[PDB]
């Protein structure tokens, strides 16, 4: 199960001179390709811990809380729209992709860190006739707003796991793309169409009026036009 | 009353419920096999006597085991002694529960069914007679409060069966109960075909006829019931229902002397032929029409008109016999002639109000009807009434459109002419006559005719529809702005309904939006001359803020309708959207013009060359 340093993904931005073997992300909320391990986050990125032993010491000492709860696994997968709380420093980070296509932290405040946006991949009726939604991180949230459909974004309180607000998939809404050649791009969508012998294709317009087309499962509605619910890094 | 042991109380309650439902289930499952007579008194003393005092309040919410046992006792003839104990105490409790404010009709229904079964099944006992009389009195008291409360069609049918059984018994002889039953029957007749089944309606009519035969009726109540029966005979297409209404009219004529003559005329009109089943007598109908054309229309009273007016409307709506339709049109013309020959303005206005209540919506329905013969008969009747009567404004407008009765000048005469070229001349003449026709008259009359001409499937008739669409766009200015908005909503509904009609709807939308654009531009400019749209709102802000805020969702729907066939229709829709933008305020036009421009750009962005050329022609017209 040993993953090579060259075989490590480009999203992590590791230093190749560091070691022979890259960390392998554990099973968890996000898939292995778009995950970012906590050891990579703390050691190679935040430079807090110099080596994996004191990375394990930190994650023992429970300063690092991921999405509210406390994780002690060194290779715990932390992914897109994940809030990491370092309680000793009182600094909160939100993981967002860079425009070039790599992971990046964002310094966020406390009341921003209190909520998290998730893409509703499933809407279904569970047992005893209880509706539920399955978000992109794997969360199952009971009793949603009946207006919530597939590919809509829900703002989730971290303390309770409850949906406060939601954004509907609609033309002229600021979405974010999370896959493919277009990865790391922020833009409002022109439209959505069906591709013959293919899938739903979404046409998105950037700030500089450039048009780029991607898969339906790749998009992520971060907010409506002119009001992003989350903070965004400099450079748009 | 020891409340110290809630466990004991719950155990006692559970034992009571299980024991009662067990006794009920024993009663239906064993049936009429066990000799119940030996344990009858013991059972009634034990389980019925304490709960009998509060059974009426207890079982109001939902059916219960004790209530089901009572219903099975009422159904089984051998179990009648259970009810007969204590002078119909259980029956009185059930009747009180029915009479009280029950939570649901699901408890009211089976009690009425059991009462009907007990009435239908006779028993030879003095207690049986007393219980039957008490149940009949309770049902007669409860019936006006039960007919309204009954929300189920099966429950209404059961109530009608119980009323028929009560009428067969003849329990009530008072005229007040007859008046209450007549009011209930009128309320039942005021309904729908989905609400009341045809067999159920026939049974209700038979019960009403039996009640009318049993009870004497005053003149005013007989006239009200005759008007209701006339409306019912107009509504009922079934000849069995027509025969039932004829029997009811015969009963009303037995009740009242002038109603005897009226019902004799109605029965002569609606007399069924013996040779053809469920078919009226053509020679008798022709003789009645010949009498009504010359001697009848002077003889018939104002109240007596309404049954024959309903019969004539039904005959005109019926497409079975064109001769009968012509006879009905002649009868309507004779009624209009009687209204004109009445010297009093109030006497003419009574018939005018009767026509506006009945005959004018009937003519509107005939114009909207797809039946060409019925539409032509309605148009001919309208023209004859326009010639006969000088009072009525749409009649004056129709005379102005007739223009001294020339065949080419008259829109109706050239339409009745078989020549499509004459129809085109009529449409072109009506386009100029829209400047003189009334707005309400145009909206009531020419719009169904123009819609029929547009929806006609022939190619020459499609040219007629295009000319009528141009005339309708011209007359939309001559029409009221509310009528224009209603016509736009109807066109949007037709576009949503049929794609083939949508292209014609798109053309009509453009040809109505261009006068709308001109009127809105004149309102924005504040021109001293009156706007094109007749009776337009004084505030230019309100009409624009209604029309544009309605048309922008329509423009969005047209843009979202991204179909290749719809794109041709969307091009006239794009022209209408450009007209709406031009009619809007200039700053609002400057804001909304990026949206229409982007829609036109998406239309022209098609890779197909022929679609691009068509969109280019449309965009050239739009520019």
């Amino acid at each position: 199960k040993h993953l090579k340093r060259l075989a490590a993904p480009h999203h992590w931005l590791l230093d190749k001179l560091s070691g022979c073997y890259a960390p392998r992300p554990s099973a968890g909320p996000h898939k292995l390709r778009e995950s970012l391990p906590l050891i990579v986050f703390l050691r190679n990125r935040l430079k807090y811990a110099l080596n994996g032993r004191e990375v394990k010491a930190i994650l023992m000492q429970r300063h690092v809380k991921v999405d509210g709860k406390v994780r002690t696994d060194t290779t715990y997968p932390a992914g897109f729209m994940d809030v990491i709380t370092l309680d000793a420093t009182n600094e909160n980070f939100r993981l967002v992709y860079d425009v070039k296509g790599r992971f990046a932290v964002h310094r966020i405040t406390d009341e921003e860190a209190s909520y998290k946006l998730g893409k509703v991949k499933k809407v279904q009726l569970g047992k005893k006739g209880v509706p539920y939604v399955v978000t992109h991180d794997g969360r199952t949230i009971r009793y949603p707003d009946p207006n919530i459909k597939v590919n809509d974004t829900v703002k989730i309180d971290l303390a309770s796991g409850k949906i406060t607000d939601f954004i509907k998939f609609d033309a002229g809404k600021l979405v974010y793309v999370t896959g493919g050649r277009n990865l790391g791009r922020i833009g409002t969508i022109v439209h959505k169409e069906r591709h013959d012998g293919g899938f739903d294709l979404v046409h998105i317009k950037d700030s500089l009026d450039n048009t780029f087309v991607t898969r339906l499962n790749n998009v992520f509605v971060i907010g409506e036009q002119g009001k992003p619910y989350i903070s965004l890094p400099k450079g748009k | 009353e020891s409340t110290e042991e809630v466990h004991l109380r719950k155990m006692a309650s559970n034992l009571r419920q299980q024991g009662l439902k067990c006794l009920s289930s024993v009663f239906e499952f064993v049936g009429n096999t066990f000799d119940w007579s030996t344990s009858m008194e013991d059972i009634y003393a034990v389980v019925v006597k304490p709960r009998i005092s509060h059974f009426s309040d207890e079982n109001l919410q939902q059916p219960s085991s004790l209530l089901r046992l009572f219903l099975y006792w009422a159904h089984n003839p051998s179990l009648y002694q259970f009810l007969y104990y204590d002078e119909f105490a259980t029956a009185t409790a059930l009747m009180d529960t029915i009479s009280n404010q029950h939570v649901k009709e699901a408890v009211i229904g089976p009690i009425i069914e059991a009462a009907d079964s007990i009435i239908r099944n006779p028993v030879n006992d003095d207690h049986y007679v007393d219980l039957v009389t008490l149940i009949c009195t309770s049902c007669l008291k409860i019936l006006p409060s039960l007919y309204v409360k009954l929300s189920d069609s099966n429950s209404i049918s059961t109530f009608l069966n119980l009323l028929v059984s009560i009428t067969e018994m003849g329990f009530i002889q008072d005229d007040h109960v007859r008046s209450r039953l007549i009011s209930s029957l009128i309320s039942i007749l005021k309904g729908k075909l989905k609400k009341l089944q045809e067999n159920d309606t026939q049974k209700i009519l038979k019960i009403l006829k039996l009640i009318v035969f049993n009870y004497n009726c005053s003149w005013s109540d007989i006239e009200e019931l005759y008007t209701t029966i006339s409306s019912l005979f107009k509504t009922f297409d079934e000849r069995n229902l027509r025969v039932s209404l004829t029997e009811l009219f015969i009963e009303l004529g037995r009740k009242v002397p002038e109603l005897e003559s009226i019902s004799k005329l109605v029965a002569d009109l609606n007399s069924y032929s013996s040779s053809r089943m469920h078919e009226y007598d053509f020679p008798r109908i022709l003789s009645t029409f010949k009498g009504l054309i010359e001697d009848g229309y002077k003889s018939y009273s104002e109240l007596e008109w309404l049954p024959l007016l309903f019969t004539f409307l039904h005959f005109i709506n019926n497409k079975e016999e064109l001769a009968l339709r012509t006879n009905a049109s002649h009868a309507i013309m004779k009624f209009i002639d009687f209204i004109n020959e009445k010297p009093n303005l109030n006497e003419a206005s009574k018939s005018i109000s009767m026509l506006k209540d009945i005959l004018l919506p009937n003519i509107r329905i005939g114009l909207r009807d797809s039946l060409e013969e019925v539409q032509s008969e309605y148009v001919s009747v309208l023209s004859y009434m326009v010639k006969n009567t000088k009072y009525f404004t749409d009649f004056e407008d129709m005379a102005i459109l007739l223009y001294n009765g020339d065949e080419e000048a008259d829109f109706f005469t050239n339409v009745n002419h078989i020549q499509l070229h004459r129809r085109q001349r009529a449409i072109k003449r009506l386009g100029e006559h829209a400047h003189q026709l009334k707005d309400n008259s145009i909206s009531h009359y020419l719009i169904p005719m123009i819609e029929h001409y547009v929806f006609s499937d022939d190619e020459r008739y499609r040219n007629i529809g295009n000319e009528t669409q141009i005339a309708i766009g011209g007359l939309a200015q001559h029409m009221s702005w509310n009528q224009y908005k209603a016509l736009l909503r109807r066109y949007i509904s037709m576009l949503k309904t049929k794609p083939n009609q949508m292209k014609q709807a798109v053309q009509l939308i453009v040809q109505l939006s261009v006068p709308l654009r001109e009127t809105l531009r004149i309102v924005r400019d504040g021109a001293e001359s009156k706007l094109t749209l007749s009776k337009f709102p004084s505030n230019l802000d309100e009409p624009s803020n209604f029309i544009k805020q309605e048309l922008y969702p329509t423009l969005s729907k047209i843009l979202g309708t991204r179909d290749d066939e719809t794109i041709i229709e969307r091009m006239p829709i794009a022209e209408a959207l450009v007209n709406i933008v031009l009619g809007l305020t200039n700053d609002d036009i400057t804001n909304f013009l990026p949206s229409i421009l982007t829609n036109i750009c998406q239309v022209l962005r098609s890779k197909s060359e022929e679609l691009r050329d068509a969109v280019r022609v449309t965009l050239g017209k739009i520019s």
Binding site: R194, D196, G197, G198 | -
Partner: protein, 138 residues
């Protein structure tokens, strides 16, 4: 004849009650295939029973949608369509046409002759070599 085979041919989990006479001859179940393809009236009032039919069977259309010209209709409830796609050979320096044959299941609702352009859609493997089912016939 719908009952030609030795086993009884019925739509699964559809029960018409012998106690109650029905105005329809048999209860029949039809499903909207999706992708904007209308359910044909032959499938609506057909008497045929087919598992592999996208409108009246358990087979659902998902994946790709293709178009092709019908070549052979000899085999039962299956057709062979030919798709001609232009190919570039660098050594020849010129575009050269190539064809691929796709054996496609045909529902009995559609009647296809040789040389008719048909629209097909991907489904679960119908047989050893069949993965495509017709959904629109032009």
């Amino acid at each position: 004849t719908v009952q030609s085979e030795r086993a009884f041919q019925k739509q699964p989990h559809i029960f018409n009650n012998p106690k109650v006479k029905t105005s329809k001859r048999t209860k029949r179940w039809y499903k909207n295939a999706g992708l904007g393809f209308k359910t044909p009236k032959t499938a609506i009032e057909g008497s045929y029973i087919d598992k592999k039919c996208p409108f009246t069977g358990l087979v659902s259309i998902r994946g790709k949608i293709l178009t092709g010209t019908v070549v052979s209709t000899k085999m039962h409830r299956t057709i062979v369509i030919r798709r001609a796609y232009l190919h570039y050979i660098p050594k020849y320096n010129r575009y050269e046409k190539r064809h691929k044959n796709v054996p496609v299941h045909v529902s009995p609702a559609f009647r296809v002759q040789v040389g008719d352009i048909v629209t097909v859609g991907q489904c679960r493997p119908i047989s050893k070599t069949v993965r495509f089912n017709v959904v629109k016939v032009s």
